[PDB]
Tab-separated table of C-alpha atoms and ligand atoms in Angstrom:
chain	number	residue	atom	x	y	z
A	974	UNK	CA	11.821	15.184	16.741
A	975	UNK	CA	13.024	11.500	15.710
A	976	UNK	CA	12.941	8.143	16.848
A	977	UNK	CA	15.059	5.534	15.391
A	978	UNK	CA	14.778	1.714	15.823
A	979	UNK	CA	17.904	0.335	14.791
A	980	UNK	CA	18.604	-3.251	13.630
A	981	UNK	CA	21.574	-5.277	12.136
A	982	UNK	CA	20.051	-7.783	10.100
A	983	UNK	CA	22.408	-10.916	8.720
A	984	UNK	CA	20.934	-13.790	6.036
A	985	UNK	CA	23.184	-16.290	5.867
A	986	UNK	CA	22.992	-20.292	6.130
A	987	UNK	CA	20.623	-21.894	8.852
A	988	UNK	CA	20.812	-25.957	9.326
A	989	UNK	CA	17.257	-26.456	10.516
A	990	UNK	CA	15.963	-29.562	12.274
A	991	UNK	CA	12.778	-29.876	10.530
A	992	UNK	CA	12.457	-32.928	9.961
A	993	UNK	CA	13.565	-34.714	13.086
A	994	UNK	CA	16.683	-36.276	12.728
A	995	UNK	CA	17.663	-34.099	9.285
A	996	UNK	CA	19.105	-31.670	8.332
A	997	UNK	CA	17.381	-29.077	6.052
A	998	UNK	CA	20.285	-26.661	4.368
A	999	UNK	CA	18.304	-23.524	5.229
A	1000	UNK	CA	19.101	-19.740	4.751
A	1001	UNK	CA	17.923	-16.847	7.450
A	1002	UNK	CA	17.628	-13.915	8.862
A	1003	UNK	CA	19.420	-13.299	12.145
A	1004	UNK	CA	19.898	-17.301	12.676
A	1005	UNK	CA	16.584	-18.260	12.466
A	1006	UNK	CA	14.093	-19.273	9.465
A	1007	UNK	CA	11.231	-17.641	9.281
A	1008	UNK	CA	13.285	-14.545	10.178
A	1009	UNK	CA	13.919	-12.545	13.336
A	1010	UNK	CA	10.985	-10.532	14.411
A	1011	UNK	CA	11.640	-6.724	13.339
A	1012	UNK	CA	9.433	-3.964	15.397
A	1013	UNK	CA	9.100	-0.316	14.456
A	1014	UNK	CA	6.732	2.190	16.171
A	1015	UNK	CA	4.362	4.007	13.686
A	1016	UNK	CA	5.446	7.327	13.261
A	1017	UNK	CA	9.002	6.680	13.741
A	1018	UNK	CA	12.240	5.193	12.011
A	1019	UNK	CA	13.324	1.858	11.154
A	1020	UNK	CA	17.220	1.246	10.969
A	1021	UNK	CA	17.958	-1.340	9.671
A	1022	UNK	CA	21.988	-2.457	8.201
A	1023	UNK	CA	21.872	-5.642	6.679
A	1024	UNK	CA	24.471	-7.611	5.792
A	1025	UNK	CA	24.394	-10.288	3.439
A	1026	UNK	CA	26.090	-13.098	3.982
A	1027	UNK	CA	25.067	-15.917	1.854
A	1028	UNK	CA	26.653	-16.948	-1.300
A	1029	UNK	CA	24.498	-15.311	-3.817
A	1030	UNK	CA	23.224	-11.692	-4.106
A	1031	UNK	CA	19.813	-10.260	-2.259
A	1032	UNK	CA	17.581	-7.417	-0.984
A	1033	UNK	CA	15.182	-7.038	1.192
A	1034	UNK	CA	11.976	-5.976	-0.002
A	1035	UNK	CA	9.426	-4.867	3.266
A	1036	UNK	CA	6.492	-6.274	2.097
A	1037	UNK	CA	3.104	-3.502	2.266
A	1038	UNK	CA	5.603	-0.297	3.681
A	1039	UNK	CA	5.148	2.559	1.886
A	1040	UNK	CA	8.289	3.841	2.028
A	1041	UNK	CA	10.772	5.768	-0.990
A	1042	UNK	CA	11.616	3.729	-4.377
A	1043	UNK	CA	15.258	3.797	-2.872
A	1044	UNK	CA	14.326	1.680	0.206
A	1045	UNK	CA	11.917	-0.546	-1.924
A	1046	UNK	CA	14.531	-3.333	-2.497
A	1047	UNK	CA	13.843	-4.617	-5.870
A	1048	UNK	CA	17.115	-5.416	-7.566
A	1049	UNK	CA	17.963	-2.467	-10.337
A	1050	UNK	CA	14.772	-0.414	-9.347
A	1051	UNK	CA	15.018	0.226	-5.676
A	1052	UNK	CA	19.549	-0.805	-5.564
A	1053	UNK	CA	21.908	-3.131	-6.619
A	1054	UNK	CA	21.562	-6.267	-5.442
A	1055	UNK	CA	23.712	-6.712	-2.149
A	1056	UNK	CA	26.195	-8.656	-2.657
A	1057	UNK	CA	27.826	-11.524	-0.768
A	1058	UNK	CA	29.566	-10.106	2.486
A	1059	UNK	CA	28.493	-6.296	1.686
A	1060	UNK	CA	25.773	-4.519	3.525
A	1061	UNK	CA	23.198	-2.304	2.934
A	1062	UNK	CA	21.005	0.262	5.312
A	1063	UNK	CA	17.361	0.289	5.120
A	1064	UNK	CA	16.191	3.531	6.786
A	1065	UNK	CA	12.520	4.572	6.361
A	1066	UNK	CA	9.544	5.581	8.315
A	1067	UNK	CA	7.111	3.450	9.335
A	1068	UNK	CA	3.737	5.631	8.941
A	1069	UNK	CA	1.657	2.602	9.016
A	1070	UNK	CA	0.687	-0.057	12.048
A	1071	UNK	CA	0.462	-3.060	11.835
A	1072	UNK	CA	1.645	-6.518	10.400
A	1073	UNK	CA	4.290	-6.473	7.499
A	1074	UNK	CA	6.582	-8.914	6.136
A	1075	UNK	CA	10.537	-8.480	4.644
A	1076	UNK	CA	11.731	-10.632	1.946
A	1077	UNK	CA	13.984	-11.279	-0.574
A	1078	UNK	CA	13.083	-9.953	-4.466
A	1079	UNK	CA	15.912	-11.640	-5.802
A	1080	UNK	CA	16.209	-14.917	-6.863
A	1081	UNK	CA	12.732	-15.334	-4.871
A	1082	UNK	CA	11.652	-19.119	-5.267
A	1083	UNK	CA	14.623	-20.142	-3.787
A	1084	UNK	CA	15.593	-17.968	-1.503
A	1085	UNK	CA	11.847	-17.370	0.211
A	1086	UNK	CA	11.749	-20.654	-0.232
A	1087	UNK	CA	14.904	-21.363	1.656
A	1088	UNK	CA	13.552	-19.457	4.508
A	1089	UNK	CA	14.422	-16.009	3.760
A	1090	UNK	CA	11.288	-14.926	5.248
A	1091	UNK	CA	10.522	-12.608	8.639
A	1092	UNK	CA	7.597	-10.354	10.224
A	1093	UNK	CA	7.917	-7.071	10.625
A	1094	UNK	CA	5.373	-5.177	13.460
A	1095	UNK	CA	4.491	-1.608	13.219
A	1096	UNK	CA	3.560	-1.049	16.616
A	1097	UNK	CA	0.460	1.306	17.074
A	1098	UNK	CA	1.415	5.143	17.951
A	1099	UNK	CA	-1.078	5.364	20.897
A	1100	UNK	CA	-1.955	1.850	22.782
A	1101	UNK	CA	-4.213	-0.414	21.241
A	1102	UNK	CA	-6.302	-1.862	23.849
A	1103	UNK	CA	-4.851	-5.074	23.184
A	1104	UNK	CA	-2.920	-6.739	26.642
A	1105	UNK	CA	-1.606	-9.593	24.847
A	1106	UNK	CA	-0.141	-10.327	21.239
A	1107	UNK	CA	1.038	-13.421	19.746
A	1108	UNK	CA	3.268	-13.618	16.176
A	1109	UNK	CA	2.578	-16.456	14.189
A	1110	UNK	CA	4.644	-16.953	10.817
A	1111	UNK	CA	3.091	-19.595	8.730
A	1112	UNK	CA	5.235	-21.109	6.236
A	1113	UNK	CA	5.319	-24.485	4.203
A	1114	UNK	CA	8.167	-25.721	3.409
A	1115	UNK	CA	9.280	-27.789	0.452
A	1116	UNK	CA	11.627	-30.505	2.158
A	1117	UNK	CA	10.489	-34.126	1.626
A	1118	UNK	CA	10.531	-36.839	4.372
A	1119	UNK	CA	15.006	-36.668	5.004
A	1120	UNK	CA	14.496	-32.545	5.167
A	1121	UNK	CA	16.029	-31.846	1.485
A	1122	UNK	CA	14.563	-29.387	-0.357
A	1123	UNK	CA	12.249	-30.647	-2.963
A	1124	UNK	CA	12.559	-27.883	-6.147
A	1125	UNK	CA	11.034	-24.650	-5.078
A	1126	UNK	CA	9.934	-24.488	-9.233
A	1127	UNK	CA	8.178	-27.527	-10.642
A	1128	UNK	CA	6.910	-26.283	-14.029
A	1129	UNK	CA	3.654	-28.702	-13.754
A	1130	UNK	CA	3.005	-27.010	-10.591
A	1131	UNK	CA	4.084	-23.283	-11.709
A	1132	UNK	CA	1.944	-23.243	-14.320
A	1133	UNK	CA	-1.495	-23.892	-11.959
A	1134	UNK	CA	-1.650	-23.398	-8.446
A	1135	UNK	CA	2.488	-23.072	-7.719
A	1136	UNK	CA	4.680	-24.887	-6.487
A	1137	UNK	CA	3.686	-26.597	-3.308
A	1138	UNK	CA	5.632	-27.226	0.229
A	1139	UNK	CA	4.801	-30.286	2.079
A	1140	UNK	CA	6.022	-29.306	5.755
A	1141	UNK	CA	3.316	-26.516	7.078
A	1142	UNK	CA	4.772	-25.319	10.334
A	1143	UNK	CA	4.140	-22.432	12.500
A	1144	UNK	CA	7.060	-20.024	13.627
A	1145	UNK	CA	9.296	-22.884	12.475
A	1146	UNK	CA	7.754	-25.679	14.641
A	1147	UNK	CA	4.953	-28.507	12.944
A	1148	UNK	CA	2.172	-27.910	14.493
A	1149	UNK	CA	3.036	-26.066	17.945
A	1150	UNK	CA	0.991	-25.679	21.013
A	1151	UNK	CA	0.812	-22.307	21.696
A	1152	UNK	CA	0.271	-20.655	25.422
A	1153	UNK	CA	-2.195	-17.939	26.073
A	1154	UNK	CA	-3.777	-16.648	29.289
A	1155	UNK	CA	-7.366	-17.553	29.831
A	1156	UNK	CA	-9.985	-15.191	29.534
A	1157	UNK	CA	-7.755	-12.615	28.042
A	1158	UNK	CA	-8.626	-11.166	24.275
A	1159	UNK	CA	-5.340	-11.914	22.509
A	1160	UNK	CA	-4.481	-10.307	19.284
A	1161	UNK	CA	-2.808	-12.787	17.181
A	1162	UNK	CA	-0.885	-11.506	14.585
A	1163	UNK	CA	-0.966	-14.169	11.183
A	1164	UNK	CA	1.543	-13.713	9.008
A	1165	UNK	CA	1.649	-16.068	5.787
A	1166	UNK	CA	5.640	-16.238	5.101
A	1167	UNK	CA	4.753	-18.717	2.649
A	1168	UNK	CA	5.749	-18.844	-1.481
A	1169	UNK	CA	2.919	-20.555	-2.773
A	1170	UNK	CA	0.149	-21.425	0.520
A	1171	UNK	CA	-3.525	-20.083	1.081
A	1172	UNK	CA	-4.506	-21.416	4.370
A	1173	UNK	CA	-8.483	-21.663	4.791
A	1174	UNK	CA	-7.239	-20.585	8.157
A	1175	UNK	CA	-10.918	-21.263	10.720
A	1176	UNK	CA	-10.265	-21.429	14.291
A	1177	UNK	CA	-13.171	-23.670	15.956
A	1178	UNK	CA	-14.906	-23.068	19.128
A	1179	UNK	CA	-12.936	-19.601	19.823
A	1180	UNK	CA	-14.690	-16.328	19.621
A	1181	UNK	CA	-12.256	-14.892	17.192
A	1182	UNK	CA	-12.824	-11.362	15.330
A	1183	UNK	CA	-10.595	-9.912	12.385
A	1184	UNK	CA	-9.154	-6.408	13.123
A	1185	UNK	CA	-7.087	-5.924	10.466
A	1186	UNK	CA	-6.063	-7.227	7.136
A	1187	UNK	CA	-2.928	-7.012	5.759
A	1188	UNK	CA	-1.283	-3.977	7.829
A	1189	UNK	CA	-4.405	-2.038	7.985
A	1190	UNK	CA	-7.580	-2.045	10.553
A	1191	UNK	CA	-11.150	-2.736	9.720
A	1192	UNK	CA	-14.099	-2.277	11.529
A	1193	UNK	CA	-13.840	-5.488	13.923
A	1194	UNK	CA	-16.162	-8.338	12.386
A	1195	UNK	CA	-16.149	-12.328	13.286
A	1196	UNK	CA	-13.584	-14.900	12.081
A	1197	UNK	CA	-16.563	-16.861	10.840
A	1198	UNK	CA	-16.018	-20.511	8.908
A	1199	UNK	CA	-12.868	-19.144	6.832
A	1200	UNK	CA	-10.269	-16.369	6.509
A	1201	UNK	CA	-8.532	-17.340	3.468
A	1202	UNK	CA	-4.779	-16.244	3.729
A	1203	UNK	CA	-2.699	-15.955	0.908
A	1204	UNK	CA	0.910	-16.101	0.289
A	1205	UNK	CA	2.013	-12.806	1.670
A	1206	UNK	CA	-1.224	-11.618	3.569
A	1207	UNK	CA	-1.757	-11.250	7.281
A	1208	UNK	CA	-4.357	-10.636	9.846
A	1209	UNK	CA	-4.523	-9.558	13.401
A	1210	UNK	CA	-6.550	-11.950	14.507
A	1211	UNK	CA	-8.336	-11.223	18.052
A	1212	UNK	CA	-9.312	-14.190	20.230
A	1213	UNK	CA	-10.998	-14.573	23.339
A	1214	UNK	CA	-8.730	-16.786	24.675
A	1215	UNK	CA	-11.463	-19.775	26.485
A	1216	UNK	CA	-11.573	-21.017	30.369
A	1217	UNK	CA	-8.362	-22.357	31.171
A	1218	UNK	CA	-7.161	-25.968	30.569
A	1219	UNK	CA	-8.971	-25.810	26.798
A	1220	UNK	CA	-7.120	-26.175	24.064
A	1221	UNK	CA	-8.210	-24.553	20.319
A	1222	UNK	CA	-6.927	-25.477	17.042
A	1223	UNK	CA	-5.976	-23.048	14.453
A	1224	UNK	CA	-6.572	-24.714	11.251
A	1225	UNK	CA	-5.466	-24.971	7.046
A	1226	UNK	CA	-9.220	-26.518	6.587
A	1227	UNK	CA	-9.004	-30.000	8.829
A	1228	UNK	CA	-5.851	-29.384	9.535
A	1229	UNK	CA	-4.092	-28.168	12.438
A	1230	UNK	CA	-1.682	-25.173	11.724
A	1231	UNK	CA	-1.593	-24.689	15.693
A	1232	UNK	CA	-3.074	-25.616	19.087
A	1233	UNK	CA	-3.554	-22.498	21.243
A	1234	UNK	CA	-3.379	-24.142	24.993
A	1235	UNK	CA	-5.544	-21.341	27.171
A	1236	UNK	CA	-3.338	-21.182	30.365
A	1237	UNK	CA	-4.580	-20.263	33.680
A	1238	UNK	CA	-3.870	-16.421	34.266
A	1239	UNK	CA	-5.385	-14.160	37.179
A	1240	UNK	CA	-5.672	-11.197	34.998
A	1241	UNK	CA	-9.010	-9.887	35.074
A	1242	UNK	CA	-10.692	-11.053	31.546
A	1243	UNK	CA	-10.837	-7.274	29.526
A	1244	UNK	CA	-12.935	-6.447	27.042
A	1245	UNK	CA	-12.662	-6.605	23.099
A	1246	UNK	CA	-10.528	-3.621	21.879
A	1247	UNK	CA	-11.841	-0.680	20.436
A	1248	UNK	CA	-11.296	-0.659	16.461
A	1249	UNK	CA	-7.888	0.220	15.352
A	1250	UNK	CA	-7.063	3.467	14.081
A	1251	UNK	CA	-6.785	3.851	10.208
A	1252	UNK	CA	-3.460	4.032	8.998
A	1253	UNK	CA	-3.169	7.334	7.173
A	1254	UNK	CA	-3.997	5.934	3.637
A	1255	UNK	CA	-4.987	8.305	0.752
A	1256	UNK	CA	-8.523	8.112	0.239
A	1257	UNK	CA	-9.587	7.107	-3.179
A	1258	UNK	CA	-11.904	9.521	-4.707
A	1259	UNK	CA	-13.967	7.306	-6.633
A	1260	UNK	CA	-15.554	10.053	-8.676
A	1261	UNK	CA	-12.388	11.347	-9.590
A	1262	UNK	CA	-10.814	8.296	-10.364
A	1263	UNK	CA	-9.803	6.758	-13.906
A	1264	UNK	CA	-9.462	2.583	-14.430
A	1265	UNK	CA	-6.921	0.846	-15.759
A	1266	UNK	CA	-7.642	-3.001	-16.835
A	1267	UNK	CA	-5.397	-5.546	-15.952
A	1268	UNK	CA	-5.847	-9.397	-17.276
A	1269	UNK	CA	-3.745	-12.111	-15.758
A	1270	UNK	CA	-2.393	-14.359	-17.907
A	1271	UNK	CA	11.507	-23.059	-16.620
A	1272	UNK	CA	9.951	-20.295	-18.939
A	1273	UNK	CA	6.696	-17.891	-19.164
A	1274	UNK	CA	3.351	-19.909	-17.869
A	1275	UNK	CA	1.888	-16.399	-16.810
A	1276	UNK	CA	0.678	-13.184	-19.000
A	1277	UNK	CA	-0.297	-9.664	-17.596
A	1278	UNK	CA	-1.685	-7.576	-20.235
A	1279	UNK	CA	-0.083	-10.212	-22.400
A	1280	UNK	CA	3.057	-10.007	-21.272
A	1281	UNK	CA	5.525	-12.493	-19.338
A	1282	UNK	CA	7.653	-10.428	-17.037
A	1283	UNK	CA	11.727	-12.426	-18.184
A	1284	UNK	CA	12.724	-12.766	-14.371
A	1285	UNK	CA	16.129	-12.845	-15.980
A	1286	UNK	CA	16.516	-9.273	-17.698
A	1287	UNK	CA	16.499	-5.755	-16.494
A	1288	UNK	CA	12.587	-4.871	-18.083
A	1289	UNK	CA	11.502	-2.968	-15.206
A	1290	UNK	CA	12.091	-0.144	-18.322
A	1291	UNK	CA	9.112	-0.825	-20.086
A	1292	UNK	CA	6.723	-0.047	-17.478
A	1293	UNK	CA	2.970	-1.899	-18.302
A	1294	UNK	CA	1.450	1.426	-16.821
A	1295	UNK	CA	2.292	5.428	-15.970
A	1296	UNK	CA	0.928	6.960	-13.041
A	1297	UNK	CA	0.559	10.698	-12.709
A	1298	UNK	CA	1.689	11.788	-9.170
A	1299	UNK	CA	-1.225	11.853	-6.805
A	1300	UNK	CA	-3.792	10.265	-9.496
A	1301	UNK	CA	-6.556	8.356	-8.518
A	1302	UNK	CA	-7.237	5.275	-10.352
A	1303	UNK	CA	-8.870	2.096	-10.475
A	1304	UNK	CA	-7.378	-1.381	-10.935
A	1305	UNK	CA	-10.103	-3.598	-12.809
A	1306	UNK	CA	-8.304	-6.769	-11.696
A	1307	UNK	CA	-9.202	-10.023	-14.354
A	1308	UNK	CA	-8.249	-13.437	-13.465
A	1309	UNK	CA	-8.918	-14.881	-16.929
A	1310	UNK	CA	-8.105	-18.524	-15.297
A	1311	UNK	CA	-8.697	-21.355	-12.989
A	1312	UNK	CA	-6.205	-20.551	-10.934
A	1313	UNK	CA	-6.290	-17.717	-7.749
A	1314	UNK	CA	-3.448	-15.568	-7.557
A	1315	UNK	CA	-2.622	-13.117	-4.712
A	1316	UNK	CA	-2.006	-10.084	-6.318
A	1317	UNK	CA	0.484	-7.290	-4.453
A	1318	UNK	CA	1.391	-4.079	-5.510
A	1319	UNK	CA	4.640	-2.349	-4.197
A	1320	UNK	CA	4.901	0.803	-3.116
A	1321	UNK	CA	1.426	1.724	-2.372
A	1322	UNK	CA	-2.297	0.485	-0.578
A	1323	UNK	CA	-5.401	-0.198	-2.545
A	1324	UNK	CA	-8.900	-0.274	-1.479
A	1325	UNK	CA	-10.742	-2.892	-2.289
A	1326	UNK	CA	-13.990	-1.957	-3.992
A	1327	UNK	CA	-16.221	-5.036	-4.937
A	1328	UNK	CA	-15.725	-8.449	-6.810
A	1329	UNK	CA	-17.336	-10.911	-9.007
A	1330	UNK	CA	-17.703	-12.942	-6.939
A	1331	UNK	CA	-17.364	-12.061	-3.171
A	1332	UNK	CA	-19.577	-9.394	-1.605
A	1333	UNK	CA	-16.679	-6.803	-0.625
A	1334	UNK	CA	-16.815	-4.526	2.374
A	1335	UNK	CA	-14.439	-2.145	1.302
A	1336	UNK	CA	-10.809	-2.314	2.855
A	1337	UNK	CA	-7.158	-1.626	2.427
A	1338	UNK	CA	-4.336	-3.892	1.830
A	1339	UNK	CA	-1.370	-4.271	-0.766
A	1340	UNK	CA	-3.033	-7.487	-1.598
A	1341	UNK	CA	-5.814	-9.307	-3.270
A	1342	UNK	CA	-6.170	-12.983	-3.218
A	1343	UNK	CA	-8.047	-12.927	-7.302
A	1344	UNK	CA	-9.721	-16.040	-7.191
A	1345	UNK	CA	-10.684	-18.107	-9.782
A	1346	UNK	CA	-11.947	-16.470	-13.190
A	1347	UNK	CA	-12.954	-13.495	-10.511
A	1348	UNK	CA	-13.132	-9.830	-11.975
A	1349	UNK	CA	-12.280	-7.574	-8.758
A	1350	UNK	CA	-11.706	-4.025	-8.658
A	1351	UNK	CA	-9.417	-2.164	-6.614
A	1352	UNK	CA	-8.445	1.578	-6.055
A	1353	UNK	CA	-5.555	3.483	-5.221
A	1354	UNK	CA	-3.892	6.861	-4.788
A	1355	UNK	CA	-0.707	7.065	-6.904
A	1356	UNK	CA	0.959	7.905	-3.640
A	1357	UNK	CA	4.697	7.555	-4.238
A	1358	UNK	CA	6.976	7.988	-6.926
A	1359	UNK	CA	8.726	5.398	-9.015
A	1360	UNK	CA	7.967	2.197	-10.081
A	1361	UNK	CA	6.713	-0.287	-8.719
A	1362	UNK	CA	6.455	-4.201	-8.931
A	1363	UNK	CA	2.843	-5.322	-9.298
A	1364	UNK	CA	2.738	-8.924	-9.426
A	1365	UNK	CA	0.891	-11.710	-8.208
A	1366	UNK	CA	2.748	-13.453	-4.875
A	1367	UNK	CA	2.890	-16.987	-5.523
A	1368	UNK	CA	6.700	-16.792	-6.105
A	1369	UNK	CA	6.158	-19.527	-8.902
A	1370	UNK	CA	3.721	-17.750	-10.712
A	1371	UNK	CA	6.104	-13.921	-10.033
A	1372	UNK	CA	9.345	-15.748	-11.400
A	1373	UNK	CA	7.235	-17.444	-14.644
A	1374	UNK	CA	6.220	-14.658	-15.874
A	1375	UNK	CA	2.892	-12.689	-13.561
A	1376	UNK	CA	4.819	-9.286	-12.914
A	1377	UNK	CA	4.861	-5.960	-13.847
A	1378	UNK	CA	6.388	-2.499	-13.126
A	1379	UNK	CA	4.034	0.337	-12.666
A	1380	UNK	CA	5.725	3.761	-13.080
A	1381	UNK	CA	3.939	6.683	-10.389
A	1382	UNK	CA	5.771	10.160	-12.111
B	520	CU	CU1	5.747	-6.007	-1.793
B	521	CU	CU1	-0.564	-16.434	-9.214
């Protein structure tokens, strides 16, 4: 009748060796930046008590679960903010496989940016085919050369693309070699922990397919040239791991992110997995459905609708749209700029429908990288009550002013 997976989760202050010979002042989850790995089964219960012990008040927002407005933890929406040396349980299925992320939605810039960043894995409720998975937490860090933190909010910088890391690293490490068994298909989960990053992420030489896009499975196709990860997206990412002895980067354009080292195994090489099972998503009805336009855009650089969001007051009140309660609606999404944004809803899963500019074949995620003056629409169930944050996930762009609160009631 109920499984449980139960976790005690601690943030608090992690002195990080990232630059060799430095130390970089960082904060963590469970000792580590980016965070300790959480797993859940689908189907079943995630525990999880955390405690906060850093200085300043957080949450812990679980970035793409659809769980209750209670769990969702955005400060004076979801809770209060959790304060220094209190705790606060996070119970809530997991209904959906795949790749999530947890993170803080308070005082975001700086705190992501400090390193309060983690995966979460929704494990698959029967097997995947897949014998062999790899986690692989991209993040780019804003330390300069003596690993100090350069500002995570440089208003030249928030006000285009955001505010830029310099240290790219991969589970922590620059540029690690990573093992993997030769011959084997190995589903590499990509998880982009980052505040303001897209990596043009392009893997040369391997035979590498997509199977899913941020938590949710598509019907397999090829890598190709490019998968273009945003700040907050993911991918499993399968790979036919070559002969042993060869050696494959995993690139951000020319370059490396990672060198995937194939390692001699004497498992028999398997075949590519079957697709993954849909997570159960409500299906648009696109007949049925009604649209709703949305135009985006040390103070507000960013519009939605016209409005800044004031990261600083309690405006989640004056919600920029009301949901009915199992509606069905479209999201025209408008970048009316130069600039791509990756836009996330909370709460809930779109479908993307088409673009401007990209062809679309149709898939689910709780985000959409909105490139440059594109015009991409996007549909949803209005699933699950409350409200919910809808903003784009460059932290920079969230915290000037590219947020809103949808109300489902
Ligand atoms: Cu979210
Ligand atoms: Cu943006």
């Amino acid at each position: 009748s109920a499984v449980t997976h139960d976790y005690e989760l601690i943030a608090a202050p992690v002195d990080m060796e990232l630059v060799p010979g430095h130390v970089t002042p960082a904060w963590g989850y469970g000792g580590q930046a980016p965070g300790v790995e959480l797993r859940c089964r689908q189907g079943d219960w995630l525990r999880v008590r955390f405690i906060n012990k850093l200085d300043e008040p957080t949450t812990i927002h679980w970035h793409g679960i659809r769980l209750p407005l209670e769990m969702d933890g955005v400060p004076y929406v979801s809770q209060l903010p959790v304060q220094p040396g209190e705790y606060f349980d996070y119970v809530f299925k997991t209904e959906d496989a795949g790749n999530f992320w947890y993170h803080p939605h308070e005082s975001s810039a700086s705190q992501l940016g400090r390193g309060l960043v983690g995966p979460l894995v929704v494990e698959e409720r029967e097997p995947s085919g897949f014998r062999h998975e790899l986690s692989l937490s991209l993040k780019t860090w804003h330390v300069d050369e003596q690993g100090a933190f350069t500002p995570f909010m440089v208003p030249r910088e928030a006000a285009r693309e955001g505010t830029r890391g310099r240290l790219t690293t991969v589970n922590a490490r620059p540029n690690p070699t990573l093992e993997l068994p030769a011959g084997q298909v190995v589903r590499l989960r990509l998880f982009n922990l980052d505040n303001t990053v897209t990596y043009r992420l392009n893997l040369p030489g391997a035979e590498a397919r997509l199977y899913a896009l941020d938590g949710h499975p598509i019907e397999p196709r090829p890598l190709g040239k490019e998968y273009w990860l945003g700040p907050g997206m993911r991918i499993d990412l399968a790979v036919r791991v070559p002969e042993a002895g060869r050696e494959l980067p995993l690139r951000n354009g020319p370059l490396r992110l990672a060198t995937l080292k194939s390692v001699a195994s004497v498992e028999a090489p398997g075949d590519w997995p079957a697709p993954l099972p849909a997570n159960p998503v409500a299906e648009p009805d696109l007949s049925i459905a009604e649209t709703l336009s949305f135009r985006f855009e040390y103070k507000y650089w960013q519009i939605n609708g016209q409005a800044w969001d004031i990261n600083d007051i309690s405006c989640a009140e004056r919600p920029i749209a009301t949901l009915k309660k199992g509606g069905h609606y479209i999201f025209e999404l408008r970048n009316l700029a130069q600039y791509q944004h990756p836009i996330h809803l909370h709460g809930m899963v779109f479908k993307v429908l088409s673009s401007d500019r990209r062809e679309i074949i149709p898939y689910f995620t709780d985000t959409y990288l909105l490139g440059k003056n594109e015009t991409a629409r996007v549909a949803l169930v209005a699933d699950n009550p409350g409200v919910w944050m809808f903003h784009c996930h460059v932290i920079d762009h969230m915290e000037t002013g590219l947020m809103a609160a949808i109300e489902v009631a």
